[PDB]
Structure formats: structure tokens, C-alpha cells
Amino acid sequence: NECISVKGRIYSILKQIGSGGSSKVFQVLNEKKQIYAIKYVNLEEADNQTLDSYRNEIAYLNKLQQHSDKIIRLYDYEITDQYIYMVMECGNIDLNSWLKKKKSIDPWERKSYWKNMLEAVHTIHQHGIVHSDLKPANFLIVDGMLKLIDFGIANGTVNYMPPEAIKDMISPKSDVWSLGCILYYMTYGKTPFQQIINQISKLHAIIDPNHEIEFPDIPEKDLQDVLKCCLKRDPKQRISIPELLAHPYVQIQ
Amino acid sequence: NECISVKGRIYSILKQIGSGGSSKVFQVLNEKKQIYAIKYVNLEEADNQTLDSYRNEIAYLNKLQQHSDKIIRLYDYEITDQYIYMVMECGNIDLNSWLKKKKSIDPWERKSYWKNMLEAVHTIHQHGIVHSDLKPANFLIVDGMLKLIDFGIANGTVNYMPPEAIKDMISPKSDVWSLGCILYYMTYGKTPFQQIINQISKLHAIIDPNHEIEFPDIPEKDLQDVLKCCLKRDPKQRISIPELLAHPYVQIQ
Ligand SMILES: CCc1cccc(CC)c1NC(=O)c1nn(C)c2c1CCc1cnc(Nc3ccc(C(=O)NC4CCN(C)CC4)cc3OC(F)(F)F)nc1-2
Ligand SMILES: CCc1cccc(CC)c1NC(=O)c1nn(C)c2c1CCc1cnc(Nc3ccc(C(=O)NC4CCN(C)CC4)cc3OC(F)(F)F)nc1-2
């Protein structure tokens, strides 16, 4: 049974949750026996470039705290030349797991989730920030409310990748794609391109105009519409977040 | 226990070997109780486009028979609107398996293999044909001699993929890359980019000039050279097959 000093105050590890290479996340117990999460990041091989990226991300998250409830809380942090410790709220589970483990989505519970994600992405969008790497993992479930976990600034599938990031061999429109895949999965039970096995076959698909993303008729046609509008390959055509906030799917019934 | 009619002559399945979706390969027993392989291809969903590709490939293989011993033998074929049956030699195993199962390569057994592959690729190269999708699978081991299995004309990793096929969002030089990865694996025990986990991280690597493919010093410096020359990102720089046939690694000691 071991501990961590963050800004001179102490927490006892209870168990490790996340691993991400040069980083670990622990559920911990603070002084007043309350429970928290600590993200830990090793800066041994950190080169100034890599380094500032982290500095930037901290600054922003820390800053964007009092802008949206749908971003994870950051309670305190320590930062030195070798490491960062961040003290964030501890949640129940992340969206991706809940997905893996879950095999039924109350159509109503799906809607709220989407609602949360949009608020979040919007916020970071209203600040020059574009995440560009969104996957169910980047969200956290905390009493049926989702939070965004990171801003995609610092530092394994191609699935949620948009056509345009591929034609790249940067737009807010790129986050809509992803966002919609995450909806798509939630809806047709899986991502739009899981079918395709061959990892290069999937790259071509993601970019070829003549491939039809399949859109199975379903009760909710709002929802059907949305996904159709989020997955429009041309970005200039793709719906925008301000539009998506004002679509029926979120607005009416 | 079941059979197959190919050009009116009959073979009894003994066991299924390959599966490839709309295709199966069987080890079979002919009349005179000799053993063969039959590739079977279903043409139900075949569209004229897809269709001719198959027609083309058959024609070529069939044709390129009496040009090189290092291409699989094709004994006879039947072709109709619904299917193809091809009767080819049956081998002992394919290179990829022998690789998976094998964990030691007589440096000498490696050399012969390379030698075989080159002869083969060269042949198909001397006919406008560029395979463009080479992986240990496309070869077959038949009494320690390798054969090429198909020509990459008809019809799941990114590993053996060359920079240039990626910047594509067609040159003989593209087959050298692949060919060299297959050598690389054989040599440093794995492909040049397996390290990289993230499937998009690997795409960037495969194309970024500043990433060093790592080249561990070893006894054979010929071999070391070769791989260094095969994996040159700029195609115009990359060595050519006629050069590779005339390199020490194949020529001297
Ligand atoms: C190095 C980490 C990292 C790097 C880059 C980017 C990101 C996120 C975008 C992150 N990743 C992170 O920064 C990160 N990863 N996790 C998991 C958390 C964070 C931040 C805060 C945070 C707050 N609360 C939690 N709660 C929990 C989330 C998931 C589980 C869990 O059950 N995991 C299981 C793992 C095995 N599978 C099969 C089933 C689920 C348990 C949890 O704590 C609880 F115990 F209290 F519930 N997690 C986190
Ligand atoms: C649909 C097929 C297809 C489509 C596109 C492209 C291509 C090749 C480029 C092909 N694929 C093919 O066209 C194709 N695939 N195989 C396997 C053969 C061919 C063509 C002729 C051919 C002739 N002889 C063999 N021999 C054998 C090759 C491998 C095994 C074997 O042991 N497989 C195991 C599978 C499980 N793993 C774990 C261990 C190895 C057994 C074999 O026959 C023997 F029994 F007599 F030894 N194979 C083939």
C-alpha cells in the first residue's frame, strides 16, 4: 500500500486504472478519506517539443474548467522537469468500456450522451481547440453524465478517422466526423467501417465517394438524419456543431 | 468424403487449406492417387470489372508458366460464369506460417529464399506486371524452394506498404520495398514498423523522412546494406531488381 505527494498533500493509491505507456492513472484516497483519480506522466524522454505540448494542454484544461461541466474536473496539479501529477475527479467508468460491456442502449440514454458530447466539443471548439482524435475513450461517465477527458493536444484504430485527415498525404469539421461515428456505433451497434477487414481497404473506403455508408431504416429518423449529415465526406458540406445543437434529434419531441 | 470435377476429371478433397472469403483451397487426390491443390473461386457477386481482373490473372499466370520455376505450377483450369477451378501443385507450407512457426533462420536458408523471391518478382516485372501486395503469404515452400502464388492483379496489415502508396491520397520500385520488409523480418526477426502500435502512427512513420528505420549491426554487412538500400523512402533512390541481383549479398563469398 503506497502513496503520492501532490503539492505536499498525500493520497494513497487504491488501484491502477489506466495505462498509456509513459503514464498511469490511479484511483486514490485522499486525507479526508475521499476518493480521486491521479493521472501520472513520466517526462524522462520528454523533448522540449513534446514538453510544451503537455504544458499547453495543462494550461487549457485548467483554464477551461469554469466553462463547462462536461469536461473532467481538475482539482490540483504538480509539475516538475521529470513528471506531472494531476488530481482529477474519479468516475465510474469510461464510455468505451461501458460500450464493450453494454449491449443495449436505451434510445433515451443515447440521446443524453450525444447531448453531453456536443456541449463539450463545442466548448473546446470555442477556443481554437480541435481534438481531432475522438473515440469513446476520451469520455468519462460520472453519474450518467459524460465528461471529456483530454483535448487531444499533447504527445489504436483508424475507425473514427475522417476522409480529410487521410487525404493529408485543420477544421472543426473533423471532430464532427468522429463524433458521428461514436453516435453511429451507439446506434447501428458498431462503427461505420468495422465491416472492412483489410486495414488499407478501410483507408480507401473512408475516402471513396462511391462507397455507401449503409443507413438502416429505424424508428428514429431524426437520429438517422443526423448520422447521415455527420458522415458527409466533403467537410464543407458536413453539418456544423452549431447546427447539430439545433437539429430536431436534440431539440424535439 | 467429397469430390470436384475439373475439365471432366475428378479429384477427392482431402482437406481444406486456405480460405479467402469467396474462395477456398483444398488439398485433393486425383485419379492416379496423386495429390494436388485446387483453388476455388465463387463468381456470384462478380461484376464484369472484378470479373475480367480474374480473367486477366489466369491468362498471365497460365502464360508465365514456362518462364520461371519460381512461380507456382498451374496444371489445368475450368472457368464458367459462376466459378473457377484451378489445379496447382500442392506445397508443404507457405512462407508466412513457416515464419510464424519458425524462430531460427539458417542465415544460409534465408539467402536462398531471397534469391528465389527476386527471380520471381523479376519475371513478373519483365511483363508489365507489378504485384504491389507482397507479404510472406504470396509465396509457397516446395522442397525448400519458394514459389510465387499470385500476381496481385485480381479482386490484412499495412506493414509491408511503401511510402509512395500512402502519398497516394505505378512503379516496379514499389515491390522492392515490400520485398525488403520480408527480408527485414527474416533478419531482425520482425517487420520494420511492428514496434509502432497505433495504426495511424504507423502510417506517418512509413512516410516521414526523419524516422530512422533501425539497422542493428550484425555479422553480415552485405545483408545489412541490402535492407538499407531496399528501404530507401524515395523510390527514385531505391535500388532496382537488376541491381539487387548483382549485389554482393547474392553474389559473393
Ligand atoms: C495515460 C492515460 C491517458 C492518456 C492519453 C489520453 C487519455 C484519455 C483521453 C488517458 N486516460 C486518462 O487520462 C484516464 N483514463 N482513465 C480511466 C481515467 C482517466 C482520467 C481521469 C479518470 C477518472 N475516473 C476514472 N474512472 C474509471 C474508468 C474506467 C474503469 C474501469 O473499470 N476500467 C476497466 C479496464 C478493463 N476493461 C476491460 C473494463 C473497464 C475504472 C475507473 O475508476 C473506478 F475504479 F473508480 F471506477 N477514470 C479516469
Ligand atoms: C483464397 C486463397 C488466396 C486468395 C488470394 C491470394 C492468395 C495467395 C497470394 C490465396 N491463397 C492461395 O491461393 C493459396 N493458399 N494456399 C495455402 C495455397 C494456395 C495456392 C496453391 C497451394 C499449394 N499448396 C499449398 N500447401 C499448403 C500451405 C499451407 C498449409 C498449412 O499448413 N496451413 C496452416 C494454416 C494454419 N496455420 C496456423 C498453420 C499453417 C498446408 C498446405 O498444404 C499441405 F497440407 F499439403 F501442406 N498451399 C497452396
Side-chain angles (χ1 to χ4, degrees):
Chain A
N1 160 90
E2 49 269 275
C3 309
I4 297 167
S5 143
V6 176
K7 294 297 219 141
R9 321 188 73 275
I10 285 65
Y11 312 71
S12 57
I13 299 165
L14 305 182
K15 55 191 211 74
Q16 159 163 147
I17 303 162
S19 248
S22 55
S23 22
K24 322 189 173 166
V25 195
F26 296 96
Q27 184 185 61
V28 313
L29 223 263
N30 85 280
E31 169 167 354
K32 284 113 259 197
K33 294 320 194 180
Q34 318 187 205
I35 157 195
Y36 288 60
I38 283 174
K39 203 191 203 156
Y40 162 86
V41 194
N42 172 265
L43 313 169
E44 279 344 286
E45 333 305 346
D47 48 284
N48 277 89
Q49 167 226 57
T50 275
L51 248 179
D52 242 297
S53 77
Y54 268 99
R55 296 185 174 121
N56 198 241
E57 183 133 342
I58 305 264
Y60 269 103
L61 173 71
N62 169 55
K63 153 76 164 296
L64 298 184
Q65 280 281 98
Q66 333 64 6
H67 285 70
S68 189
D69 57 295
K70 313 285 204 56
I71 303 177
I72 171 157
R73 293 351 279 168
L74 162 43
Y75 291 115
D76 186 37
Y77 68 91
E78 199 192 288
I79 183 173
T80 67
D81 280 350
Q82 301 84 43
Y83 58 81
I84 301 165
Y85 282 110
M86 303 159 257
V87 192
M88 15 207 67
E89 29 157 2
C90 183
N92 315 90
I93 194 194
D94 72 284
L95 190 52
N96 199 102
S97 299
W98 200 75
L99 271 274
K100 298 184 143 144
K101 152 146 43 179
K102 199 59 186 306
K103 280 311 168 180
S104 46
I105 308 175
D106 179 7
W108 166 103
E109 78 189 320
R110 175 177 47 237
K111 185 157 288 188
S112 162
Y113 282 167
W114 185 239
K115 301 200 188 185
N116 294 172
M117 310 198 292
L118 294 191
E119 186 175 325
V121 168
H122 190 220
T123 304
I124 65 114
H125 271 220
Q126 300 179 304
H127 289 265
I129 298 186
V130 174
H131 189 309
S132 73
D133 186 8
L134 287 173
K135 311 141 290 194
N138 302 103
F139 302 82
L140 180 77
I141 315 194
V142 174
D143 328 315
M145 190 180 357
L146 283 185
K147 277 117 167 298
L148 176 70
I149 301 192
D150 83 310
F151 298 167
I153 290 182
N155 182 25
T157 171
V158 54
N159 279 1
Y160 305 79
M161 186 171 177
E164 61 254 56
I166 299 184
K167 310 177 199 170
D168 190 56
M169 338 293 217
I170 282 45
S171 173
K173 277 296 178 49
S174 313
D175 277 335
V176 180
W177 189 272
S178 316
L179 252 207
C181 296
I182 301 177
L183 191 52
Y184 187 107
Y185 186 152
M186 272 175 149
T187 310
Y188 295 150
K190 52 104 180 181
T191 82
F193 289 82
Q194 250 167 331
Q195 329 75 241
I196 299 170
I197 317 170
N198 208 256
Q199 270 286 321
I200 289 68
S201 298
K202 208 175 321 160
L203 298 186
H204 299 352
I206 293 187
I207 52 198
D208 162 59
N210 293 279
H211 185 334
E212 277 191 82
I213 299 77
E214 199 177 324
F215 284 93
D217 272 73
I218 44 175
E220 308 202 69
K221 303 307 191 174
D222 283 349
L223 205 29
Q224 182 141 25
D225 178 53
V226 171
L227 303 164
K228 290 184 200 143
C229 316
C230 284
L231 287 169
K232 308 201 172 183
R233 286 175 165 99
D234 177 21
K236 299 196 166 190
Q237 304 245 17
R238 201 174 305 130
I239 184 173
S240 83
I241 296 278
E243 315 195 84
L244 283 170
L245 282 178
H247 180 286
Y249 184 55
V250 305
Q251 286 300 343
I252 307 170
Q253 55 175 2
Chain B
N1 160 90
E2 49 269 275
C3 309
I4 297 167
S5 143
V6 176
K7 294 297 219 141
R9 321 188 73 275
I10 285 65
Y11 312 71
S12 57
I13 299 165
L14 305 182
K15 55 191 211 74
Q16 159 163 147
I17 303 162
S19 248
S22 55
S23 22
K24 322 189 173 166
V25 195
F26 296 96
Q27 184 185 61
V28 313
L29 223 263
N30 85 280
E31 169 167 354
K32 284 113 259 197
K33 294 320 194 180
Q34 318 187 205
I35 157 195
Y36 288 60
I38 283 174
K39 203 191 203 156
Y40 162 86
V41 194
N42 172 265
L43 313 169
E44 279 344 286
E45 333 305 346
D47 48 284
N48 277 89
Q49 167 226 57
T50 275
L51 248 179
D52 242 297
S53 77
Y54 268 99
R55 296 185 174 121
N56 198 241
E57 183 133 342
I58 305 264
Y60 269 103
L61 173 71
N62 169 55
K63 153 76 164 296
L64 298 184
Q65 280 281 98
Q66 333 64 6
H67 285 70
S68 189
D69 57 295
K70 313 285 204 56
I71 303 177
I72 171 157
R73 293 351 279 168
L74 162 43
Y75 291 115
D76 186 37
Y77 68 91
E78 199 192 288
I79 183 173
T80 67
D81 280 350
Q82 301 84 43
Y83 58 81
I84 301 165
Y85 282 110
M86 303 159 257
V87 192
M88 15 207 67
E89 29 157 2
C90 183
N92 315 90
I93 194 194
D94 72 284
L95 190 52
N96 199 102
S97 299
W98 200 75
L99 271 274
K100 298 184 143 144
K101 152 146 43 179
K102 199 59 186 306
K103 280 311 168 180
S104 46
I105 308 175
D106 179 7
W108 166 103
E109 78 189 320
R110 175 177 47 237
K111 185 157 288 188
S112 162
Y113 282 167
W114 185 239
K115 301 200 188 185
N116 294 172
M117 310 198 292
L118 294 191
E119 186 175 325
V121 168
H122 190 220
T123 304
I124 65 114
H125 271 220
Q126 300 179 304
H127 289 265
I129 298 186
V130 174
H131 189 309
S132 73
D133 186 8
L134 287 173
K135 311 141 290 194
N138 302 103
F139 302 82
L140 180 77
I141 315 194
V142 174
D143 328 315
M145 190 180 357
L146 283 185
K147 277 117 167 298
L148 176 70
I149 301 192
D150 83 310
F151 298 167
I153 290 182
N155 182 25
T157 171
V158 54
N159 279 1
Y160 305 79
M161 186 171 177
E164 61 254 56
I166 299 184
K167 310 177 199 170
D168 190 56
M169 338 293 217
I170 282 45
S171 173
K173 277 296 178 49
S174 313
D175 277 335
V176 180
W177 189 272
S178 316
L179 252 207
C181 296
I182 301 177
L183 191 52
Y184 187 107
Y185 186 152
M186 272 175 149
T187 310
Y188 295 150
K190 52 104 180 181
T191 82
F193 289 82
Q194 250 167 331
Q195 329 75 241
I196 299 170
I197 317 170
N198 208 256
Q199 270 286 321
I200 289 68
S201 298
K202 208 175 321 160
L203 298 186
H204 299 352
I206 293 187
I207 52 198
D208 162 59
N210 293 279
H211 185 334
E212 277 191 82
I213 299 77
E214 199 177 324
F215 284 93
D217 272 73
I218 44 175
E220 308 202 69
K221 303 307 191 174
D222 283 349
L223 205 29
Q224 182 141 25
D225 178 53
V226 171
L227 303 164
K228 290 184 200 143
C229 316
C230 284
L231 287 169
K232 308 201 172 183
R233 286 175 165 99
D234 177 21
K236 299 196 166 190
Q237 304 245 17
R238 201 174 305 130
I239 184 173
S240 83
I241 296 278
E243 315 195 84
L244 283 170
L245 282 178
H247 180 286
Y249 184 55
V250 305
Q251 286 300 343
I252 307 170
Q253 55 175 2

Short mmCIF file of all heavy atoms in Angstrom, two decimals, chain A residues 55-89:
data_model
loop_
_atom_site.label_atom_id
_atom_site.label_comp_id
_atom_site.label_asym_id
_atom_site.label_seq_id
_atom_site.Cartn_x
_atom_site.Cartn_y
_atom_site.Cartn_z
N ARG A 55 2.54 21.17 -21.49
CA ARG A 55 2.37 22.41 -20.77
C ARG A 55 1.09 23.07 -21.30
O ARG A 55 0.22 23.50 -20.53
CB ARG A 55 3.58 23.32 -20.99
CG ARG A 55 4.92 22.81 -20.46
CD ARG A 55 6.03 23.88 -20.63
NE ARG A 55 7.32 23.55 -20.03
CZ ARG A 55 8.46 23.46 -20.72
NH1 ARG A 55 8.47 23.68 -22.02
NH2 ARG A 55 9.60 23.15 -20.10
N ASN A 56 0.98 23.13 -22.62
CA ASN A 56 -0.17 23.74 -23.24
C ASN A 56 -1.47 23.09 -22.78
O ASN A 56 -2.40 23.77 -22.35
CB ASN A 56 -0.08 23.62 -24.75
CG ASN A 56 -1.00 24.59 -25.47
OD1 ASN A 56 -1.89 24.18 -26.22
ND2 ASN A 56 -0.78 25.88 -25.25
N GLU A 57 -1.52 21.77 -22.88
CA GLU A 57 -2.73 21.05 -22.55
C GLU A 57 -3.11 21.33 -21.10
O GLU A 57 -4.28 21.58 -20.80
CB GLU A 57 -2.56 19.55 -22.78
CG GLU A 57 -3.84 18.73 -22.53
CD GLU A 57 -4.15 17.72 -23.64
OE1 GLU A 57 -3.62 17.86 -24.76
OE2 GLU A 57 -4.94 16.78 -23.39
N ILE A 58 -2.15 21.31 -20.19
CA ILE A 58 -2.50 21.54 -18.80
C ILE A 58 -3.16 22.88 -18.68
O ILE A 58 -4.25 23.01 -18.12
CB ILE A 58 -1.31 21.61 -17.90
CG1 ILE A 58 -0.47 20.35 -18.04
CG2 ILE A 58 -1.80 21.68 -16.47
CD1 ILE A 58 -0.78 19.31 -16.98
N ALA A 59 -2.48 23.89 -19.21
CA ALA A 59 -2.95 25.27 -19.13
C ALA A 59 -4.42 25.33 -19.56
O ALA A 59 -5.28 25.82 -18.82
CB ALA A 59 -2.10 26.15 -20.03
N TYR A 60 -4.70 24.80 -20.74
CA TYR A 60 -6.04 24.85 -21.28
C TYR A 60 -7.04 24.14 -20.40
O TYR A 60 -7.98 24.75 -19.91
CB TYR A 60 -6.06 24.25 -22.69
CG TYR A 60 -5.82 25.27 -23.79
CD1 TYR A 60 -4.59 25.35 -24.43
CD2 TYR A 60 -6.81 26.16 -24.17
CE1 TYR A 60 -4.36 26.29 -25.42
CE2 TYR A 60 -6.59 27.10 -25.17
CZ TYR A 60 -5.36 27.16 -25.79
OH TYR A 60 -5.11 28.12 -26.76
N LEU A 61 -6.87 22.85 -20.18
CA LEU A 61 -7.82 22.14 -19.35
C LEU A 61 -8.08 22.96 -18.09
O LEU A 61 -9.20 23.37 -17.79
CB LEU A 61 -7.29 20.77 -18.96
CG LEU A 61 -8.18 20.03 -17.95
CD1 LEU A 61 -9.48 19.57 -18.60
CD2 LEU A 61 -7.43 18.86 -17.41
N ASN A 62 -7.01 23.22 -17.36
CA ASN A 62 -7.10 24.01 -16.16
C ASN A 62 -7.96 25.24 -16.39
O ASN A 62 -8.78 25.61 -15.57
CB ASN A 62 -5.73 24.46 -15.73
CG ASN A 62 -5.79 25.49 -14.64
OD1 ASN A 62 -6.40 25.26 -13.60
ND2 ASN A 62 -5.16 26.63 -14.87
N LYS A 63 -7.73 25.88 -17.52
CA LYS A 63 -8.42 27.11 -17.81
C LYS A 63 -9.88 26.82 -18.11
O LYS A 63 -10.77 27.40 -17.53
CB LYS A 63 -7.75 27.79 -19.01
CG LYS A 63 -8.66 28.68 -19.83
CD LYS A 63 -8.94 30.00 -19.14
CE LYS A 63 -9.53 31.02 -20.11
NZ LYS A 63 -8.55 31.35 -21.18
N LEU A 64 -10.12 25.89 -19.02
CA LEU A 64 -11.46 25.64 -19.48
C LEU A 64 -12.33 25.01 -18.41
O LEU A 64 -13.40 24.49 -18.70
CB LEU A 64 -11.44 24.72 -20.70
CG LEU A 64 -10.70 25.35 -21.87
CD1 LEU A 64 -10.77 24.46 -23.09
CD2 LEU A 64 -11.31 26.69 -22.16
N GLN A 65 -11.88 25.06 -17.16
CA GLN A 65 -12.63 24.37 -16.13
C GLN A 65 -13.98 25.03 -15.94
O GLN A 65 -15.02 24.39 -16.04
CB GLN A 65 -11.85 24.36 -14.82
CG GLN A 65 -10.78 23.29 -14.77
CD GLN A 65 -11.35 21.93 -14.45
OE1 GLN A 65 -11.59 21.12 -15.35
NE2 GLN A 65 -11.57 21.67 -13.17
N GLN A 66 -13.96 26.33 -15.68
CA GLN A 66 -15.17 27.04 -15.32
C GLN A 66 -15.93 27.48 -16.56
O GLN A 66 -16.59 28.52 -16.55
CB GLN A 66 -14.82 28.26 -14.45
CG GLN A 66 -13.52 28.11 -13.66
CD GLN A 66 -12.30 27.99 -14.57
OE1 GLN A 66 -12.41 28.13 -15.80
NE2 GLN A 66 -11.12 27.74 -13.98
N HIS A 67 -15.82 26.71 -17.63
CA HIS A 67 -16.60 26.97 -18.84
C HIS A 67 -17.64 25.90 -19.12
O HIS A 67 -18.68 26.18 -19.71
CB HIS A 67 -15.68 27.10 -20.05
CG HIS A 67 -14.93 28.39 -20.12
ND1 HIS A 67 -13.91 28.71 -19.24
CD2 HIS A 67 -15.01 29.43 -20.99
CE1 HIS A 67 -13.39 29.88 -19.58
NE2 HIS A 67 -14.04 30.33 -20.63
N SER A 68 -17.37 24.66 -18.71
CA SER A 68 -18.28 23.57 -18.99
C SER A 68 -18.17 22.41 -18.02
O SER A 68 -17.09 21.91 -17.77
CB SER A 68 -18.06 23.05 -20.40
OG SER A 68 -19.09 22.14 -20.75
N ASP A 69 -19.33 22.01 -17.50
CA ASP A 69 -19.46 20.87 -16.59
C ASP A 69 -19.15 19.56 -17.29
O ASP A 69 -19.04 18.52 -16.66
CB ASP A 69 -20.89 20.83 -16.03
CG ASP A 69 -21.96 20.74 -17.14
OD1 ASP A 69 -22.10 21.70 -17.95
OD2 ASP A 69 -22.67 19.70 -17.21
N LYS A 70 -19.01 19.60 -18.60
CA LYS A 70 -18.89 18.37 -19.34
C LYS A 70 -17.45 18.16 -19.75
O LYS A 70 -17.14 17.54 -20.77
CB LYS A 70 -19.81 18.42 -20.55
CG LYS A 70 -21.22 18.91 -20.22
CD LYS A 70 -22.05 17.86 -19.50
CE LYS A 70 -23.53 18.11 -19.72
NZ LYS A 70 -23.90 18.17 -21.18
N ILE A 71 -16.55 18.69 -18.95
CA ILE A 71 -15.14 18.42 -19.10
C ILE A 71 -14.69 17.96 -17.73
O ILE A 71 -15.19 18.43 -16.71
CB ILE A 71 -14.41 19.69 -19.50
CG1 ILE A 71 -15.03 20.23 -20.77
CG2 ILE A 71 -12.94 19.42 -19.71
CD1 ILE A 71 -14.44 21.51 -21.22
N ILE A 72 -13.77 17.02 -17.69
CA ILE A 72 -13.39 16.47 -16.41
C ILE A 72 -12.84 17.56 -15.48
O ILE A 72 -12.20 18.52 -15.91
CB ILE A 72 -12.38 15.33 -16.63
CG1 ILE A 72 -11.78 14.89 -15.31
CG2 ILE A 72 -11.33 15.75 -17.64
CD1 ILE A 72 -11.25 13.49 -15.37
N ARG A 73 -13.12 17.43 -14.19
CA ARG A 73 -12.63 18.41 -13.21
C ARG A 73 -11.17 18.15 -12.96
O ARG A 73 -10.73 17.01 -12.90
CB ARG A 73 -13.35 18.28 -11.85
CG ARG A 73 -14.83 18.65 -11.83
CD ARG A 73 -15.27 19.29 -13.14
NE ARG A 73 -14.92 20.71 -13.21
CZ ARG A 73 -14.98 21.43 -14.31
NH1 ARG A 73 -15.37 20.87 -15.45
NH2 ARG A 73 -14.65 22.71 -14.29
N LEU A 74 -10.41 19.23 -12.81
CA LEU A 74 -9.02 19.10 -12.45
C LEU A 74 -8.80 19.83 -11.15
O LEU A 74 -8.80 21.04 -11.12
CB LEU A 74 -8.15 19.72 -13.54
CG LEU A 74 -6.71 20.07 -13.16
CD1 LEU A 74 -6.08 18.95 -12.32
CD2 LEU A 74 -5.92 20.32 -14.43
N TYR A 75 -8.59 19.07 -10.08
CA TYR A 75 -8.55 19.66 -8.74
C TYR A 75 -7.23 20.32 -8.37
O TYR A 75 -7.22 21.41 -7.81
CB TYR A 75 -8.88 18.61 -7.69
CG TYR A 75 -10.32 18.19 -7.74
CD1 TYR A 75 -10.67 16.89 -8.08
CD2 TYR A 75 -11.34 19.08 -7.44
CE1 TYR A 75 -11.99 16.49 -8.12
CE2 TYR A 75 -12.67 18.69 -7.47
CZ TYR A 75 -12.99 17.39 -7.81
OH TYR A 75 -14.30 16.97 -7.83
N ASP A 76 -6.13 19.66 -8.67
CA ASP A 76 -4.84 20.28 -8.45
C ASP A 76 -3.79 19.57 -9.27
O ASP A 76 -4.02 18.46 -9.74
CB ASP A 76 -4.49 20.25 -6.97
CG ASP A 76 -3.23 21.02 -6.65
OD1 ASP A 76 -2.99 22.08 -7.26
OD2 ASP A 76 -2.47 20.55 -5.78
N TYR A 77 -2.64 20.20 -9.46
CA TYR A 77 -1.58 19.56 -10.19
C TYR A 77 -0.23 19.96 -9.67
O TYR A 77 -0.06 21.04 -9.11
CB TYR A 77 -1.67 19.90 -11.67
CG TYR A 77 -1.38 21.34 -11.96
CD1 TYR A 77 -0.08 21.75 -12.25
CD2 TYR A 77 -2.38 22.31 -11.93
CE1 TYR A 77 0.22 23.09 -12.50
CE2 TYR A 77 -2.10 23.65 -12.18
CZ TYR A 77 -0.79 24.03 -12.47
OH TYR A 77 -0.47 25.35 -12.70
N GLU A 78 0.73 19.06 -9.84
CA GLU A 78 2.13 19.34 -9.59
C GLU A 78 2.86 19.10 -10.92
O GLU A 78 2.54 18.17 -11.67
CB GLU A 78 2.66 18.40 -8.51
CG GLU A 78 3.95 18.85 -7.82
CD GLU A 78 4.60 17.76 -6.95
OE1 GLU A 78 4.06 17.42 -5.86
OE2 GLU A 78 5.67 17.23 -7.35
N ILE A 79 3.82 19.96 -11.22
CA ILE A 79 4.61 19.77 -12.42
C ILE A 79 6.09 20.11 -12.23
O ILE A 79 6.44 21.19 -11.74
CB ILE A 79 4.05 20.60 -13.58
CG1 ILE A 79 4.86 20.33 -14.83
CG2 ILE A 79 4.08 22.08 -13.23
CD1 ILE A 79 4.28 20.98 -16.02
N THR A 80 6.95 19.18 -12.61
CA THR A 80 8.37 19.36 -12.47
C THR A 80 8.98 18.84 -13.73
O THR A 80 8.27 18.38 -14.62
CB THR A 80 8.93 18.52 -11.38
OG1 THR A 80 8.82 17.15 -11.79
CG2 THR A 80 8.18 18.74 -10.09
N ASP A 81 10.31 18.87 -13.79
CA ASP A 81 11.01 18.54 -15.02
C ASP A 81 10.94 17.07 -15.38
O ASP A 81 11.25 16.68 -16.51
CB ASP A 81 12.47 18.96 -14.89
CG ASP A 81 12.65 20.44 -15.13
OD1 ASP A 81 11.66 21.08 -15.58
OD2 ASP A 81 13.76 20.95 -14.88
N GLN A 82 10.51 16.26 -14.43
CA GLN A 82 10.52 14.82 -14.62
C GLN A 82 9.11 14.27 -14.72
O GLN A 82 8.89 13.20 -15.29
CB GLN A 82 11.28 14.15 -13.47
CG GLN A 82 12.72 14.61 -13.33
CD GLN A 82 12.85 15.90 -12.52
OE1 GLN A 82 12.19 16.07 -11.48
NE2 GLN A 82 13.70 16.81 -12.99
N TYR A 83 8.14 15.00 -14.18
CA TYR A 83 6.81 14.45 -14.13
C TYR A 83 5.70 15.46 -13.98
O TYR A 83 5.92 16.62 -13.63
CB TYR A 83 6.73 13.45 -12.99
CG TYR A 83 7.07 14.05 -11.65
CD1 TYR A 83 6.14 14.78 -10.93
CD2 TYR A 83 8.33 13.87 -11.09
CE1 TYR A 83 6.43 15.30 -9.71
CE2 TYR A 83 8.63 14.39 -9.86
CZ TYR A 83 7.68 15.11 -9.17
OH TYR A 83 7.98 15.64 -7.93
N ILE A 84 4.49 15.00 -14.25
CA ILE A 84 3.30 15.72 -13.86
C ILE A 84 2.43 14.81 -13.03
O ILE A 84 2.31 13.63 -13.33
CB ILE A 84 2.47 16.09 -15.05
CG1 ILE A 84 3.29 16.95 -15.99
CG2 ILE A 84 1.24 16.80 -14.61
CD1 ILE A 84 2.66 17.04 -17.34
N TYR A 85 1.83 15.36 -11.98
CA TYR A 85 0.71 14.71 -11.34
C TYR A 85 -0.50 15.61 -11.45
O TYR A 85 -0.43 16.80 -11.16
CB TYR A 85 1.01 14.44 -9.87
CG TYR A 85 1.90 13.25 -9.61
CD1 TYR A 85 3.21 13.41 -9.15
CD2 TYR A 85 1.44 11.95 -9.82
CE1 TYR A 85 4.02 12.32 -8.90
CE2 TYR A 85 2.26 10.86 -9.57
CZ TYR A 85 3.55 11.05 -9.12
OH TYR A 85 4.36 9.97 -8.88
N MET A 86 -1.62 15.05 -11.90
CA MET A 86 -2.87 15.78 -11.90
C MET A 86 -3.88 15.07 -11.05
O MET A 86 -4.01 13.85 -11.10
CB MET A 86 -3.42 15.90 -13.31
CG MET A 86 -2.50 16.52 -14.30
SD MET A 86 -3.01 16.03 -15.94
CE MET A 86 -1.80 14.80 -16.27
N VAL A 87 -4.62 15.84 -10.27
CA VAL A 87 -5.65 15.29 -9.43
C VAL A 87 -7.01 15.61 -10.04
O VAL A 87 -7.44 16.76 -10.02
CB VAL A 87 -5.56 15.89 -8.04
CG1 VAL A 87 -6.41 15.12 -7.08
CG2 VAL A 87 -4.11 15.88 -7.60
N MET A 88 -7.66 14.61 -10.61
CA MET A 88 -8.97 14.80 -11.22
C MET A 88 -10.05 13.96 -10.52
O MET A 88 -9.75 13.04 -9.76
CB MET A 88 -8.91 14.45 -12.71
CG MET A 88 -7.66 13.68 -13.10
SD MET A 88 -7.13 13.90 -14.83
CE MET A 88 -6.65 15.62 -14.85
N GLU A 89 -11.31 14.29 -10.78
CA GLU A 89 -12.42 13.53 -10.23
C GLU A 89 -12.28 12.10 -10.69
O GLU A 89 -11.75 11.83 -11.77
CB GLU A 89 -13.74 14.10 -10.72
CG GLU A 89 -13.62 14.75 -12.08
CD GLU A 89 -14.94 14.81 -12.82
OE1 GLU A 89 -15.96 14.38 -12.22
OE2 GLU A 89 -14.96 15.30 -13.98
#
